[PDB]
């Protein structure tokens, strides 16, 4: 999905192995905030949100807590106390088209900044001046969304990148999303300190 229309997936009750993704060189960016990226499988939270969108490379640095820019201010804002991870990978072979792609948009103007995890898809004509726009574009009256125009020949800083932000939400409810929690071999007839299921 486009960055302004970021998609949200809900994850309840399913074991996942974040080790096959962390060990993958395919992902150009794997940065976690509030939780160490190595120690991830042990953590347990009741629900998981997966926000997905597409940006350009120069904006991948904007997907982080306490950041500013077009994306952070007008498209997707992460809270300062965000506890989760941000993963991004180059999608030039998929989301770039010769002549420019017209399917991915981003919000260019907005009078106020987005709240954390806010989703704005309004297409109201941005009034930059004092004169009120009446639905017609013109001087100080611009459309709020703009197309990236991704091309395969673009610089890697301007090539398309697919970004997925995983957040782990714990509520006043049982924790239902758990990590792999691998095991080891067992030995008999010897004094051992053991840790079975619970």
């Amino acid at each position: 999905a486009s960055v302004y229309a970021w998609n949200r997936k809900r994850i309840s009750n399913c074991v996942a192995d974040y080790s096959v993704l962390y060990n993958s060189a395919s992902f150009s960016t794997f940065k976690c905030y509030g939780v160490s990226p190595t120690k991830l499988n042990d953590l347990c939270f009741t629900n998981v949100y997966a926000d997905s969108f597409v940006i350009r490379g120069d904006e991948v640095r904007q997907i982080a807590p306490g950041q500013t820019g077009k994306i952070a201010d007008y498209n997707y804002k992460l809270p300062d106390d965000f506890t989760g991870c941000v993963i991004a990978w180059n999608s030039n072979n998929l989301d770039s088209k010769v002549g420019g792609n017209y399917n991915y948009l981003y919000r260019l103007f907005r009078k106020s900044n987005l709240k954390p995890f806010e989703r704005d898809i309004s297409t109201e004509i941005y009034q930059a001046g004092s004169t009120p726009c009446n639905g017609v574009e013109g001087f100080n009256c611009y459309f709020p969304l703009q197309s990236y125009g991704f091309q395969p020949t673009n610089g890697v800083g301007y090539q398309p990148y697919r970004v997925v932000v995983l957040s782990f939400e714990l509520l006043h409810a049982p924790a239902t999303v758990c990590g792999p929690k691998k095991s080891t071999n067992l030995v008999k007839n010897k004094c051992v300190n053991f840790n079975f299921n619970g």
Partner: antibody
Amino acid sequence: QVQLVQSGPEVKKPGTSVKVSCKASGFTFTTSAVQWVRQARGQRLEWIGWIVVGSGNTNYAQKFQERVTITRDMSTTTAYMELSSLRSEDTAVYFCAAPHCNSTSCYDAFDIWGQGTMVTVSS
Amino acid sequence: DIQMTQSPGTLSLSPGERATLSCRASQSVSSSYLAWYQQKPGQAPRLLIYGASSRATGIPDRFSGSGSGTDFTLTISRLEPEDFGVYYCQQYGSSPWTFGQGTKVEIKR
């Protein structure tokens, strides 16, 4: 210091191209717009076209749709105007104009103007 | 395209009189999208009035503006020696944003 500085004088042969620069200062370029206007020596003002800095969308006049292309670069806060296939009729003074804007709103007219760039085209 | 016409061609007036300039559009244009500019020989245009009735920053209060639709007027209450130049009216609502042909205000003698 809300400034708008243009290129120096240009002297090009007929059939060539000229690229006039226009650099902004003081206000936030990223959310403004830049128009280009030409004036022949002792004549009236002839509007060439305008560009939205944030989006890059351009609108040209009928008489300049064929040989004028207006561009911008927010990184160097500079807008350019390329004029291809020059001729003696193009010998004039070119101005760029922009409304000064803060981070969220813009002025309701073109109050900032450049000093002007004289372009002479002859053999 | 919208055609902007200015009048008079030459305004010969004495310093201290009241100047009046006219601007006519070939079709009705928004009052909030009209501007007036002043240009002196060898100088860049200078914005005087916008939105037909909004004085710009630093422009003296002797400059005023009125009009609506196709006819607009620029009024100078008391003409100062620093005001003798060329005046243009431009509409910037409908593209192309055409200019007028200019009005030369000279010192009468």
